[PDB]
Design a protein around this ligand. Structure first.
Ligand SMILES: O=C(O)CNC(=O)C(=O)O
Ligand code: NI
Ligand SMILES: [Zn+2]
Length: 331
């Protein structure tokens, strides 16, 4: 078996290899990449997402989110407080202000130490889940707005025709902005391109060990666990690498820099944080190997994990026994 220790693999496709997206995902998996839950893909030197980012300040962040933490430094939840709308230009200025800017630091490791020591004492503001794309329409390779759709994948694999669309989302981050431990909706893949700015550090649990993380989460957030059997779908819980190590949870970490793609694989739990002002684009996607994961994905029915209407068809077709209960949670 390839990659038995479930290490995060890094790929350097040639421009020829970068033509066929599906084929390269399958190639990465043939090398065991999926066992980590996360892979990095560095595009060939000839590739670019767009000409410049010189004209993006007028994008609107309609609902910036202030991420307010509760708990202890290594075990906390965060809730999102809605703030007034601001442009990306205004957001960038805010990110770079004395209140929110990245502190002096020696290297990525020093900054990581500072993040886990001090995150809970600040409330950074995130621009998340903004529908849109920053890929040039003429970018033909790994353009996250031009991928084959999950609906078409399901149709190709299972013969079912369903409603729904899936399009990319933009994320504007600043120092300490945080993404909580989660897998994707329906345990889909995700792909994330860091367009511009400071890095993003990722933590990931191998899919074959995801239930170990779930069991620890239930112990660490006991009230949340009683409220919902799948409460990590609420995307509010953080657990530090120190606490993961203390509890023997297998995981890996890696830092993504501007110009790099990350792919998360079905049922690969991940979390992380931004180093400073940046902009990422991400979208969910599927492959034939995903279908089994979609069938088995655990659902939140408590009402906290409201999702896109695109997910209705996924649950309806792949999980008909769970559909009624889940739909009650969505309404
Ligand atoms: O970048 C972020 O804030 C969160 N991204 C993801 O969880 C992802 O790409 O799957
Ligand atoms: Ni994700
Ligand atoms: Zn729930």
């Amino acid at each position: 078996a390839q990659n038995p220790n479930c290490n995060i693999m890094i790929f350097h496709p040639t421009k020829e290899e970068f033509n066929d997206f599906d084929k390269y995902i399958a190639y990465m998996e043939s090398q065991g990449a999926h066992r980590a839950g996360l892979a990095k893909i560095i595009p060939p030197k000839e590739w670019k997402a767009r000409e410049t980012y010189d004209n993006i300040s007028e994008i609107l962040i309609a609902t910036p989110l202030q991420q307010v933490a509760s708990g202890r430094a290594g075990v906390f939840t965060q809730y999102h407080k809605k703030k007034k709308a601001m442009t990306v230009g205004e957001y960038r200025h805010l990110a770079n202000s004395k209140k929110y800017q990245t502190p002096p630091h020696q290297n990525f490791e020093d900054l990581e130490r500072k993040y886990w020591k001090n995150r809970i004492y600040n409330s950074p503001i995130y621009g998340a889940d903004i529908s849109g794309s920053l890929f040039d329409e003429n970018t033909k390779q790994w353009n996250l707005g031009h991928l084959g759709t999950i609906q078409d994948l399901l149709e190709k694999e299972c013969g079912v025709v369903i409603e729904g669309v899936n399009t990319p989302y933009l994320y504007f981050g600043m120092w300490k902005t945080t993404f909580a431990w989660h897998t994707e909706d329906m345990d889909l893949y995700s792909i994330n391109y860091l367009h511009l700015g400071e890095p993003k550090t990722w933590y990931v649990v191998p899919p074959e060990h995801g239930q170990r993380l779930e069991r620890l989460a239930r112990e660490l957030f006991p009230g949340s666990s009683r409220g919902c059997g799948a409460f990590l779908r609420h995307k509010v819980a953080l657990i530090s690498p120190t606490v993961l190590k203390e509890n023997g949870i297998p995981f890996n970490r890696i830092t993504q820099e501007a110009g790099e793609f990350m792919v998360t694989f079905p049922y690969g739990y991940h979390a992380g944080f931004n180093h400073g002002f940046n902009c990422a684009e991400a979208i969910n996607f599927a492959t034939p190997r995903w279908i089994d994961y979609g069938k088995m994905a655990s659902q939140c029915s408590c009402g906290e994990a409201r999702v896109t209407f695109s997910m209705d068809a996924f649950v309806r077709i792949l999980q008909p026994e769970r559909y009624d209960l889940w739909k009650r949670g969505q309404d």
